[PDB]
């Protein structure tokens, strides 16, 4: 697998977690992922990067006391990472970005 915008948005709002095919950046690194070589598919077959906290430093996503944001890669299959991400809050608002976190739009 579930790696589409609708597939993971509906799965996260329902189960309140990411599907089994996601791994954190540090989990991927421990397994041998080298970002400069775009080898994720070779060292962790069937997996995508997801679940890391997104700081939202630049304040583009709506804030609230106690709300924290997490991100997940969408549409990834192999090669270097793409620029599609799903942003989900602790209160399950879901936003999408297709331009490397430049802009976001609400999807759930």
Curated annotation (Swiss-Prot):
Keywords: Endonuclease, Genetically modified food, Hydrolase, Nuclease, Secreted, Signal
GO CC terms in record: extracellular region
Biotech and industrial use: Introduced by genetic manipulation and expressed in male sterile maize and rape by Plant Genetic Systems and in radicchio rosso by Bejo Zaden. Barnase expressed in transgenic plants will specifically destroy the tissue(s) where it is expressed. After cell transformation, protein expression and plant regeneration, the active nuclease destroys the pollen producing organs thus rendering the plant sterile.
Keyword presence, DNA damage: no
Positions of the catalytic residues: 71, 100
GO molecular function, a single term: RNA endonuclease activity
EC annotation from Swiss-Prot or TrEMBL: 3.1.27.-
Intracellular or extracellular location(s): Secreted
Function: Hydrolyzes phosphodiester bonds in RNA, poly- and oligoribonucleotides resulting in 3'-nucleoside monophosphates via 2',3'-cyclophosphate intermediates.
Similarity field: Belongs to the ribonuclease N1/T1 family.
Name this polypeptide is given: Ribonuclease
Organism of provenance: Bacillus amyloliquefaciens (Bacillus velezensis)
Residue span relative to the full protein: 50 to 157 of 157
């Amino acid at each position: 697998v579930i790696n589409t915008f609708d597939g993971v948005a509906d799965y996260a709002q329902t189960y309140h977690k990411l599907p089994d095919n996601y791994i954190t950046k540090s989990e991927a690194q421990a397994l041998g992922w080298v970002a400069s070589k775009g080898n994720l598919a070779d060292v962790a077959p069937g997996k995508s990067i997801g679940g890391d906290i997104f700081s939202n430093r630049e304040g583009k996503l709506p804030g609230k006391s106690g709300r924290t944001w997490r991100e997940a890669d969408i549409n990834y299959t192999s090669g270097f990472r793409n620029s599609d991400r799903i942003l989900y809050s602790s209160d399950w608002l879901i936003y999408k970005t297709t331009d490397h976190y430049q802009t976001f739009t609400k999807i759930r």
